[PDB]
Design a protein around this ligand. Sequence first.
Ligand SMILES: [Zn+2]
Length: 463
Amino acid sequence: GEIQWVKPNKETGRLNINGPTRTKLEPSVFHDVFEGNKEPAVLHSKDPRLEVDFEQALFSKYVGNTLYEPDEYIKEAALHYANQLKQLDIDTSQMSMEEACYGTENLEAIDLHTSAGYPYSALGIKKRDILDSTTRDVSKMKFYMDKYGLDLPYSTYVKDELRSIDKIKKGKSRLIEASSLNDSVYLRMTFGHLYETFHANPGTVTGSAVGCNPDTFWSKLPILLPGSLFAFDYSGYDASLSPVWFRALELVLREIGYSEEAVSLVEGINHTHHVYRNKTYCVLGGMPSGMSGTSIFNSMINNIIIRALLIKTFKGIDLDELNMVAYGDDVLASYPFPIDCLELARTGKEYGLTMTPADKSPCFNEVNWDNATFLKRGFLPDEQFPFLIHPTMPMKEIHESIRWTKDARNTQDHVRSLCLLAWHNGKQEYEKFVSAIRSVPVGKALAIPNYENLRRNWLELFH
RNA sequence: CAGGUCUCUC
RNA sequence: AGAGAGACC
Ligand SMILES: [Zn+2]
């Protein structure tokens, strides 16, 4: 992706979008009980921790575009992924506006506890003023999509979250490109049934792990991904996507049966306008982060990328022997013979993608089940039942999370969630985590799950 | 102060 | 149906 132009809001006739300025994070009661390095990301031009210009750092993620139209490798990739999707028989029909707003069994309702985006945000109209879970009326909604249309700008906010020390100094805070309620509705009407299919089928037919539960999905993964594993990291995947990958997505959608009017919505994803504070700007390429289907489309595009990288980099690849799952930019894949990701990464740069080793070292060392990570978690066979696989969140990540809070009223739930993650690293680490928690007054007041109970409940998931 | 998935609590 | 937390693009 690449910023094509920047204009003042006076010039564009767009109203201003000023997000919050101060972090809601504070040191928790456990801040000094565990070691950690992360702090709240920079949210403001004049944060004293900054060491470069803040806004230059913010938009530096748009590294530019390379290919704009598919080559033979990307077209064979899109078609191969498309035919694979056909076995799911996705309903390419339009979803009812009622179901698109209020949800089905496999589609969650529009989040009514959150902003309605441009222009409703600036005019003080909240989602709850238009939609209502009880009446399920779409009448007010239909009026406002006719009042305001589609293809409305994304509102930009800086994301309030923990970041490493190095990303705070270099102003590398993340951004939220918030969609307008009208566009989430129309995207949900167009692709709602595809979202349903994807949510219900995490695995290697969708090629997507959206909807997976790591507690149970991890045991399936070595079976779904036989043979030699490959994986790597992307730098700023979403923002690095050139328009070729949105063209490629258009071919996948067409081949699985989508009408031309449905497929036309992709150009409105590839070419988007955004308002940050007092300025409008155009972005060509790049997936918007706050869009309906961001996770699924990023995941679908990743299935195209991996396939096209394979057949362009190496001779004699049979794409039918590829197995992979993606959760947006995160990928774990398998092929019957090892795949050299140093060569994949070189082909990647030509497609405008920056790919680095999985182990965060400089060398593309071997990925196997003892060091693979997915959604930040490792794979650890159970000592008693070696076919059941524990997802292992590193204790370093759990330490980082526990040291801070946005609302100390929910300390207990926060700690409980971290204990549901931590015990997979084994009894020794878990009791050492619990003891460290119990070492401060609030820690002695929390209902902490007992290790044996966590293990019992997990075993019972498999019966 | 966005789009989602997952899990937990009366 | 109401409330939270974890991880994600
Ligand atoms: Zn434009």
